[PDB]
Amino acid sequence: EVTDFVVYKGNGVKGLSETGIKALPEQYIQPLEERLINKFVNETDEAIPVIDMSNPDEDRVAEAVCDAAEKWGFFQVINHGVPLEVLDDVKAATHKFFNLPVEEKRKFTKENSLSTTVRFGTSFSPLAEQALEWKDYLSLFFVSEAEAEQFWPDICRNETLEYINKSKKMVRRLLEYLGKNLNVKELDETKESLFMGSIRVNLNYYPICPNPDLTVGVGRHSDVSSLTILLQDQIGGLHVRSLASGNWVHVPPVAGSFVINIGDAMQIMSNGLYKSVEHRVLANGYNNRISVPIFVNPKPESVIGPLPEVIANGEEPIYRDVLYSDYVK
Ligand code: NA
């Protein structure tokens, strides 16, 4: 139907959006409860914690992260150390990829990509008979720089690699914070595979939508990551459900900012201390948007479970130890 143009012929929702369609197809019309929160107007005051990492006493900034991570499951960082040059080469390379001729982006579909670690796809849905999301993406699972050379798009490889390169030390800082109340004062090599074992990065593009209220960019969900890290563009559109009020908060795209949330893996290993919370992506009817999330994960064969350091003081374990790959599968 419309599936043919979008999916089977690989135009995606961007090229479909570029046909100037005045009306949204049935495939993307989200359920009622999704369309209700789209029409939910907000509280004029509540917001996600903003943390300045350039602040000297590094032990107040430490307990700020988990004053954020325990109650909100979400926070933003402003002076994180990743040079702002890199954030704006990668957001460009994202655009120059999606603005590539279609003939060349068909090369990274599940059928045409010469590696499964790379895949350009469109209109996602976890389940069958379910509404699809108004979104195109390029999912990049990191193996090596070698497998980047051979399988990553040349028009956006170096920017992405460099963006991983620079982000990964900020990540190390954040984790060695996080261990605070988890009684883990130094990052070691077994835990490094439990937290930063595997890395995946998506290049997201959200084209302008004719009927923004019927669909979403991303449906209600919690990341299964250890933690994510979100680089938004200047419109943004992240929507987070609070644990205090229970309402939904629109997250403001700050000058030179990352949005870090929390994943199932961290919640499990923290024995429920950290919260992996629900969040959406709104559809915008006026502008095209992009998004470059990094998904920081355990290794696929990592057996995660409550860290021994969290259960030693006579607390009881809330979770089984489970294989990570069997969990996401
Ligand atoms: Na997410």
Residue numbers in the entry: 15 to 343
Which sentences did the original study use to describe this structure?
In this study, we determined the crystal structure of F6’H1 apo enzyme by molecular replacement and also generated a homology model of C2’H structure. Diffraction analysis of the colorless plate shaped F6’H1 crystals indicated that they belonged to space group C2, with unit-cell parameters a = 193.22 Å b = 54.55 Å, c = 78.82 Å and γ = 111.5°. The F6’H1 structure consists of residues A15-A343, B15-B141, B144- B344, 28 solvent molecules modeled as water and two sodium ions. As expected the F6’H1 structure closely resembles the structure of the A. thaliana Anthocyanidin synthase (ANS) search model. Like other members of this class of enzymes the structure contains an N-terminal DIOX_N (PF14226) domain, residues 62-172 linked to a C-terminal 2OG-FeII_OXY (PF03171) domain, residues 212 – 312 that contains the catalytic site22. Strands β1, β2, β10, β7, β12, β5, β4 and β3 form an 8-stranded mixed β sheet, which assumes a β jellyroll fold common to this family of enzymes. Sheets S1 and S2 together form a large (2,309 Å3) hydrophobic pocket that contains the catalytic site23. The F6’H1 substrate binding pocket is contained within the C-terminal 2OG-FeII_OXY domain with its dominate feature being the 2-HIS-1-carboxylate facial triad (residues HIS 235, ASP 237 and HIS 293) that is involved in iron binding. However, in the apo structure reported here the iron site is occupied by a sodium ion. Many of the key residues (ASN 218, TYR 220, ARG 303 and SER 305) involved in binding the 2OG co-substrate are structurally conserved in the F6’H1 structure.
Recently, the actual enzyme involved was identified and characterized from A. thaliana and was designated as feruloyl-CoA 6’-hydroxylase (F6’H1)10. The product 6’-hydroxyferuloyl-CoA is converted into a simple coumarin scopoletin via spontaneous trans/cis isomerization and lactonization. The activity of F6’H1 is entirely dependent on the presence of 2-oxoglutarate and the Fe (II) ion. Sequence alignment showed that F6’H1 contains the conserved Fe(II)-binding motif (His-X-Asp-Xn-His) and the 2-oxoglutarate C5 carboxy group binding motif (Arg-X-Ser).
